[PDB]
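Components:
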Amino acid sequence: KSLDPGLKKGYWAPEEDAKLLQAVAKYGEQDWFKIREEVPGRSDAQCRDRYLRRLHFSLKKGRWNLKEEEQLIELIEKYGVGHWAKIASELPHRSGSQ
DNA sequence: CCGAAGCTTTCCACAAGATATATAAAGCCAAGAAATCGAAATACTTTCAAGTTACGGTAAGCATAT
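Structure:
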């Protein structure tokens, strides 16, 4: 992911909407190294997390309403702290980075 | 009549030798098969590198309420 003349460190998504999303219909959630052979300027390490955190559907999103604090309480009540402990290994897509 | 120059081989002698059984106990040497075991190569288990994906850690620059 460094010292590579073929990678691009941009911030926006130039042609990423077509180069990266086609794999959704092409390959499964495995063998990401097959994708970088066709998409230039993108590395698999960042592409995995980009795909995951961009195409996820089940996330706690929206405005902080009068019912979300109970959701946070029941989330931190499942196993413990969750953010950095080992219990994050079983949390489905509830990684600490988010 | 004085002087000068030419022991290996091939056969008779016939009295011994040679090749022949025959037990017969005894161990060994000696070549041909049958059984046995050591070296190991073409294979199987496991070890060990080597890159690689699932799973996160902090941190930085932009949207919007007060």
